[model samples]
Target: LQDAEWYWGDISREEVNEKLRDTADGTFLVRDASTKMHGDYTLTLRKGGNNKLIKIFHRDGKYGFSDPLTFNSVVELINHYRNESLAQYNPKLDVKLLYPVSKY
Candidate 1:
């Protein structure tokens, strides 16, 4: 099993999967897990034992460090991505989908 931590409470699992799969070249999720402080973030591939770490610019245009700190192997990262990208208990809400009602 993998960690199901997410910084945003409103994002969907499907959306997370799509973002991860579509990241630009030279970057990948270095950490597959998360804590209360952070969720899924990415980093440039290691080169000469160093890489640049970065946070996700969320779909909503908010930026945050949303992943764990320790790096994972490619297979481990894939497994986590496939099995636990979605948070286990985070509730997602789409404010745009709600219709305003007027009191009569």
Candidate 2:
């Protein structure tokens, strides 16, 4: 999990946006908490020529995307979503985790 390419630690939002900018829709990554809000982490993905951000929450010893679907770890969260569509939550996000941004 630690070696997952999308699990970037302590990075900035500008960089995240830049990284996903030209990537295909559904290309994504996980990063540090937002500036003011204390979230577990931030999930940023490229869609429709822009980047969309989602707050990943941690509660009751588990992690969640939009809440109803929670997981044992962020890895499982991303892995599951990779094979599933996120369109159920939002019409604009007819997306899935197809690509993970890499440092290498």
Candidate 3:
């Protein structure tokens, strides 16, 4: 998912906060999960001066955040949120992923 520009592998939570530092709400990035398991990943976002981490679950070749709505890949899952606000499903997140912490 390197081409996706949002997947930063194995980056710690502290580093994730640094990358998204001072960004506006809804800005986000995907990173390898601390669980250290294959195929595990996380979705981190900046909200109200805080960085929140959400684990992405992969099952049956599908990816999601423990939500009924799923996607073919992590990138696809994220793309869906960029267009459809996550709050539609999880009110706690309350974001549309408006900005991607660009890999560039």
Candidate 4:
């Protein structure tokens, strides 16, 4: 059984589950609710045999958990952090850059 609730936007839950169930070495994807630079992500456990649990979150790209987790444990961790993120970190709020745009 699987369930997902988005804090900022919409997603295909069926697609997420299908990807998780068929995956064998973990699955990942970057998603944007709007046209922002950052978005939410979904990760599914593929390496943890008999411990398949797909975890999802909306967070910055350059961060990692404090402790290392098994593939399955990672899933549980996401749920734990996600609750905190939801209560403290508000995804509905838009992120903006203060610097002026520069051409490359």
What is the per-residue lDDT of model 3 for residues 3-65, given as tens digits with 9 covering 90 to 100?
677665557767777877887765787677645466667777887587877776775557766
For candidate 3, what is the total of clashing residue pairs? 0
Question: 13-94 in candidate 2: lDDT tens per residue?
Answer: 7778777768776677777885455547777777758677777667555776655645467667666677776674768546
Per-residue accuracy of model 1 over 1-104 as CA lDDT, tens digit each? 13322322324334434444434332233333334445444422222233333334333323333344244333444344444442322457211101111112
Error of 1 at 54 (Å): 2.2
List per-candidate RMSD values in Å.
18.0, 3.2, 3.0, 16.7
- Single out the weakest 10-residue window by summed lDDT for candidate 4: 95-104
Candidate 1's displacement at residue 30, Å, is 2.4
Best candidate (score: TM-score) = 3
Candidate 3 clashing pairs, residues 3+ apart or interchain: none
lDDT of each: 0.33, 0.69, 0.68, 0.34
TM-score of 1: 0.22
RMSD of 4: 16.7
Q: Identify the superior model by TM-score, candidate 2 or candidate 3.
A: 3
* Segments of candidate 2 deviating more than 4 angstroms: 34-39, 66-70, 88-93
The lDDT of model 4 is 0.34
Clashes of each: 4, 0, 0, 0
Model 2 alpha-carbon miss at residue 20, Å:
1.6
Error of 3 at 11 (Å): 1.8
Which pairs clash in the backbone of model 4? Answer: none
